[PDB]
Swiss-Prot record:
Belongs to the LRR-containing bacterial E3 ligase family. Residues 234-477 are annotated as: E3 ubiquitin-protein ligase catalytic domain. This is E3 ubiquitin-protein ligase ipaH3. Changing residue 313 to A/S: Loss of ubiquitin ligase activity. The keyword Repeat applies. Transmembrane segments: none annotated. One of its GO terms (biological process) is modulation of process of another organism. The LRR (leucine-rich repeat) domain forms a slightly curved solenoid and may mediate interaction with target proteins. It catalyses: S-ubiquitinyl-[E2 ubiquitin-conjugating enzyme]-L-cysteine + [acceptor protein]-L-lysine = [E2 ubiquitin-conjugating enzyme]-L-cysteine + N(6)-ubiquitinyl-[acceptor protein]-L-lysine. GO terms for cellular component: extracellular region; host cell cytoplasm. It is an enzyme of class 2 (transferase). Its EC number is 2.3.2.27.
Amino acid sequence: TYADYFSAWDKWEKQALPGENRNEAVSLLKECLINQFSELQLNRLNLSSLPDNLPPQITVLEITQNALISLPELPASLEYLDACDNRLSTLPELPASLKHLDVDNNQLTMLPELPALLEYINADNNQLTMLPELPTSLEVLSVRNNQLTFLPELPESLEALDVSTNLLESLPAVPTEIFFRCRENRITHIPENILSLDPTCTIILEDNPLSSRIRESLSQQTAQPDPRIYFSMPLADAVTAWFPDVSQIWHAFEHEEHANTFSAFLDRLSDTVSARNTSGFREQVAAWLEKLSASAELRQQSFAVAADATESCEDRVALTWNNLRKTLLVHQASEGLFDNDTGALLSLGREMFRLEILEDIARDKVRTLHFVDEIEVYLAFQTMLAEKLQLSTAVKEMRFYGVSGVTANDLRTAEAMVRSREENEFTDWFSLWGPWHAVLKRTEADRWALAEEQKYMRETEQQIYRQLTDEVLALRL
């Protein structure tokens, strides 16, 4: 009986908060039932709840612009739900007939199971960290301004994807035109295969931490005839940006040799890493800069390392950074950081060489690739392999390691590559290593000057220093 509905609704009317028009709601509810209408609209009534039972035959429900915290059991044949502009914290089971779900501008942390006939889903402006498995006839999924870091499998029928203002670390895998709105995410790179997508497909990448090298490479080949892709296109400011005055203390070194070139390094280094937060990297670079501000010699030698690696090393800040750590190590060694710790210096050597091998591998993979920076690949290896390859001084990014075209097989191949290559070249590599030579100059200057005289191609230096090393290595047994 309709009387059961009317009585329940009348009871509900009287628990309205002062600004809440439950009275008009009951009129609308009653009108809807009496006439067996398919549409019910309870818009702009400051509803703080809904009655437990809604007209069971409605096919369309509008409950826009209230203060709803949750919804009651939805009618079984509902095809269209607009519940945008409330405070929804959860949703009830969605009826199998749902075609259209608009839930924009609520407080949703998750979504329930999505039924098969869903054609449009809008959950813009919520707090989603995840999407359920998407229905197989979904046409449009708008989900902007949430907190997603990954999408599920996109269905073949999908025709528009709006994931603007989210935390996506990489471009969604592609499943009639297809549209990907991906602005304001944390996409640091795109796949190489990207340009071989058909021109019915259109991608928006504007405002992402994509480096200017990646961006300029995109502009270059999209201009050349013949997938539409929309994307965006000195000197004391560079040191300050890595903190937290240090800016004023650094201002004094403005008019030094190769100053301009050092600000170029930092900013290119920043453009490649600045989305990592944690990292990790930022903390280590700052401490390193702190050491540079303390010594004049360390500063001057670092600037020249930046300068000498500018000719064709501009797409390889990874190497330059690895050499700047070398320069720090050399400087530290010459000031006695390693005695009696020839074993500790040996352990660190193994660590440096392992990282050097991984850098080789990174450079190899990226050398031809235009849409990824070496640092992306190099940090990926680092974070995935530090434990197995025991890399204590490695930067371990918690995010961004999901790089396109780096496979599990690459990871394993790399680890093995580091082992055999180490097993074959370390001792020789170490005998030529800068910081080792600083120790040999500082402490064993007796055998050093003798071996310098003993030398009277680089092949000879190798033979002479290997001799010198295996000598001193016997003493520290």
